[PDB]
Design a protein around this motif. Structure first.
Motif, PDB file in Angstrom:
ATOM      1  N   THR A  11      53.605  59.248  43.859  1.00  0.00           N
ATOM      2  CA  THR A  11      52.878  60.110  42.932  1.00  0.00           C
ATOM      3  C   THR A  11      52.925  61.524  43.508  1.00  0.00           C
ATOM      4  OG1 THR A  11      50.930  59.010  43.891  1.00  0.00           O
ATOM      5  CG2 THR A  11      51.363  58.638  41.559  1.00  0.00           C
ATOM      6  N   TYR A  55      55.906  67.081  40.190  1.00  0.00           N
ATOM      7  CA  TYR A  55      56.398  65.718  40.386  1.00  0.00           C
ATOM      8  C   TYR A  55      57.930  65.743  40.350  1.00  0.00           C
ATOM      9  CZ  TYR A  55      56.475  60.646  40.112  1.00  0.00           C
ATOM     10  OH  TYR A  55      56.734  59.305  40.354  1.00  0.00           O
ATOM     11  N   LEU A  60      48.781  60.789  37.398  1.00  0.00           N
ATOM     12  CA  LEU A  60      49.657  60.386  38.498  1.00  0.00           C
ATOM     13  C   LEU A  60      51.031  61.055  38.532  1.00  0.00           C
ATOM     14  CD1 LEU A  60      49.047  56.641  37.613  1.00  0.00           C
ATOM     15  CD2 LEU A  60      48.163  57.641  39.691  1.00  0.00           C
ATOM     16  N   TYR A  61      51.796  60.867  37.455  1.00  0.00           N
ATOM     17  CA  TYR A  61      53.176  61.359  37.406  1.00  0.00           C
ATOM     18  C   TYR A  61      53.381  62.760  36.807  1.00  0.00           C
ATOM     19  CZ  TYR A  61      53.134  56.374  38.228  1.00  0.00           C
ATOM     20  OH  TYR A  61      52.836  55.121  38.712  1.00  0.00           O
TER      21      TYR A  61
END
Ligand SMILES: *[C@@H]1O[C@H](CO)[C@@H](O[C@@H]2O[C@H](CO)[C@@H](O)[C@H](O)[C@H]2NC(C)=O)[C@H](O)[C@H]1NC(C)=O
Ligand SMILES: *[C@@H]1O[C@H](CO)[C@@H](O)[C@H](O)[C@H]1NC(C)=O
Lengths: 164, 109
Positions: free
Chosen positions: A43, A49, A82-83
């Motif tokens: 993550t 990201y 998260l991503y």
């Protein structure tokens, strides 16, 4: 398969880009959250990201079992946390293997209080072949994969009981 | 193609999976492409998967190949916005029967 030899092909430390720390309440041990020890949940770092790439070329002299997973979020905001990016993907490849999965976001019922899901696919790396990883999100990586030591005729016995 | 041949015809098609968006653009000039095949007993849709792989024959790009057996009087439809490797031909069955594939390194005498 009669004996394995665990070998780490993608160390947690030498992957710089993302935060590997995550693990959740399902994997909790005595109320303390945890994860799959052989795996890594990638993550982001700081709103970025970035491109997650990986490679392994197998020296080991006997073949290698390797597993991965792809995260499926319960909701759009679960994903976005998260991503950081939508429409993400995971892609793994080998000489013989090519796979790309696009993660799925939907509301799913409660099993261990979770609408998230995780899907593992696996391969057997042969001699000298190289395995590549690429993801814009949702990947669950191997830290290690398994060299076979002993080949041989064995079985899996189904039993409740125990060795004497 | 409407099949007029009088027999079943084995038919093969393909789909390109490139190594980068650069390949995809330099070939197919756009993205989000599909290849789509159909028959009476088949409809199949494919979405070309562009990733990084080890060179094989000096290639990280690959080609996935699929086949169907088209029955008499049926018709087969191909539509793609990119990455299609199309059949020029397909093979009617002229003779059926007991036969096999024998695995040998040897030769005929
Ligand atoms: C594909 O072509 C064949 C022949 O060119 C078609 O067969 C004919 O279909 C018409 C319309 O129904 C009939 O009037 C003829 O009697 C048929 N002839 C034969 C020999 O079958 C066939 O219908 C076409 N495929 C489709 C999906 O319509
Ligand atoms: C992996 O290492 C072996 C050692 O010689 C080599 O033969 C093979 O080509 C290597 N794979 C790659 C990525 O070139």
């Amino acid at each position: 398969v009669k004996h394995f030899e665990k070998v780490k092909i993608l160390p947690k430390d030498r992957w710089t880009q993302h935060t590997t720390t995550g693990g959740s309440r399902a994997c909790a041990v005595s109320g303390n959250p945890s994860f799959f020890r052989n795996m890594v949940w990638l993550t982001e770092k700081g709103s970025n990201y970035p491109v997650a790439k990986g490679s392994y070329n197998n020296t080991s002299g006997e073949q290698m079992l390797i597993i991965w997973g792809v995260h499926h979020p319960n909701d759009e905001t679960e994903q976005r946390t998260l991503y950081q990016n939508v429409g993400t993907y995971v892609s793994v490849g080998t000489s013989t293997l090519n796979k790309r999965s696009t993660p799925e976001i939907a509301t799913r019922p409660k099993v261990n209080g979770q609408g998230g899901r995780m899907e593992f696919s696996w391969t057997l790396l042969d001699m000298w072949d190289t395995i590549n990883f690429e993801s814009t999100g949702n990947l669950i990586a191997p830290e290690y994969g398994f060299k076979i030591s002993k080949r041989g005729s064995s079985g899996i016995m189904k039993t409740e009981g125990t060795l004497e």
